[PDB]
Structure formats: structure tokens, C-alpha cells
Amino acid sequence: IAPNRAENAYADYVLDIGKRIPLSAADLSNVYESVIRAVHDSRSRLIDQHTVDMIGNTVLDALSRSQTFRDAVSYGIHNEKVHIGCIKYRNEYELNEESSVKIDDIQSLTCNELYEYDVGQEPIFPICEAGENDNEEPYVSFSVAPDTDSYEMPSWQEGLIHEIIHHVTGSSDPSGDSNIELGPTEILARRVAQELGWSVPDFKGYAEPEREAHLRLRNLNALRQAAMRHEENERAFFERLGTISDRYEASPDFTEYSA
Ligand SMILES: [Mg+2]
Ligand SMILES: [Zn+2]
Which of 8, 38, 146, 157 could bridge 222 with an S-S bond, Cβ 3.0-4.6 Å? Predict the structure, then answer.
């Protein structure tokens, strides 16, 4: 009898069961290829090439260097969860209701209104979730990627791994809001981060105020950085973010930014 998917015990269950049938080198090779394909096919729903690359780098690095991630992934493949190669990626955002910002839509946002608000009143929020589309195909929506070498990068990577773990292990977050338990999804993601040398803050609970503040500020900064990357194409940037947030396809070739 397995632990419930929302209890901390579920994390160790997943790893124990996952280690029983390890990915062969050929198995891993094929998973590696499926992820590359999946991420490449995610372009039409990601904000920019940088984010495409970073998602790819992050998942592939985790597969290459983290036994925990490989165990979680193998668990999913052999125990009727999501095969990681089936997962596509998106950068869906949502207007913040409390914001004083006066805009009808994400498309209308400007770099300015993004920088004229600190955490608490920021104009938009990323949607970070493991969901499924109409055809029941799994996707992960997550923050745009922060700049290479940014403070935000390891936390962003750990958070991305977190969402994938939902899919590939079927793990949940804690049922109630807690300051002392992380839940099995976050537990696993933290182990992966530790194995890969991603420096993330040592939080105790999934809903700890410091954790909530950290995430919000990471997201705001990742978004500011992403916008600044496309400073010359400001309208194109927010229009694409809106297109994706409305659940439409944008150019898989990012022609909106083209020289
Ligand atoms: Mg709208
Ligand atoms: Zn979660």
C-alpha cells in the first residue's frame, strides 16, 4: 500500500519503487531525445528562445546528473504516471486583481508598469502548474526564464523540476497550507536541486511566508529580466505573453522579435 500522494512519505515511496527498474543507458538515451523534441515543440507556447533553451538545459541536466530525478522519471514510466517526454511547456500569465495598474489585458502591458511596482502590487503573475489540455496531454506552465547567471536561475530551475515531478510521479503539494511541511513534490524537487548544485533557500514549509515572498519576487524579477531582453521589441514581448496566456499559439520561430 502506497502513501497518499499528498503526504511526505510519498516522496520516498516514489524513489524506492523507482529504483526497482532503473533506466538503461539506451532507455535514458531515448528519454533524453523525447525531452529535446518535447521542448522544441513547446516553442509556440514559450515567450522566447532563451526560455526554450533553459527549460531544455534544466530538464536534461536533471536527467543526466540527478539520480533522484532519474528515479522519479523511471517511476512514472513504469508505474502508470506521465512519461516525461510527453510533457510540453508554456509561459501562461494572469492579471493580478489587486493591482492598481490600469490595463485591460497583458497585451497592453509596458516595461514601465512592470518596474513601477514591487511584490504585492505587481501587474501580472505567472501560472505555475502541472495541467492537462483538452486532449488530456500533460503540460507545465511556469515563469518565463530569468537571465543566464541571474540570482533567480537556480530557484527557477528547482521550481520547474517541481512542476514536472507532479506529472511524472503523480505527487501533490500539502493539502493544507503549512509552514513546517514541504509536501512530497517539493521534497523531491529539493533533493534534485541538491544533487545538481542549484542553490535554493532552505525553506521548511510549502506555504511559509518567506517562501511565498521569495517565489513572488523571483517571478517578478524573471519577468523584468525577460522583458529587458526584448527591450527593443516591447510591444511584441507583451503581445506574445498575452497570446500564450490566452492559450493560443505564437510563432514557433519567434518571428515577432525578428531583426
Ligand atoms: Mg484578455
Ligand atoms: Zn506543486
Answer: 146
- List the domain range (segments joined by +) for residue 113: 1-259
| Residue pair 189/168 in contact by the 8 Å Cβ criterion | no
Distance 141 CA to ligand 2 centre (A): 11
Method by which this entry was solved: X-ray
How remote is the CA of residue 129 from the centroid of ligand 1, in Å? Answer: 20
CA 166–ligand 2 middle distance (angstroms): 7
DSSP strand E in 91-226: where? 93-95, 124-126, 129-132, 138-141
- C-alpha distances in angstroms, 187 versus 9, 88, 205, 224? 10, 23, 10, 29
Neighbours of 27 (CB within 10 A): 15
Count of domains for the chain: 1
Distance 161 CA to ligand 2 centre (A): 10
Query: For the CA atoms of the chain, what is the radius of gyration?
Result: 18
CB 58 within 8 A of CB 160: yes
Q: Which ligand is nearest to the CA of 105?
A: 1
Structure-block grid coordinates of residue 39: 521542448
CA 129–ligand 2 middle distance (angstroms):
7
Report which of 62, 77, 81, 80 is spatially closest to residue 24, judged by C-alpha positions: 77
Resolution in A: 1.9
For 140, phi then psi, to 5°, come to -120, 125
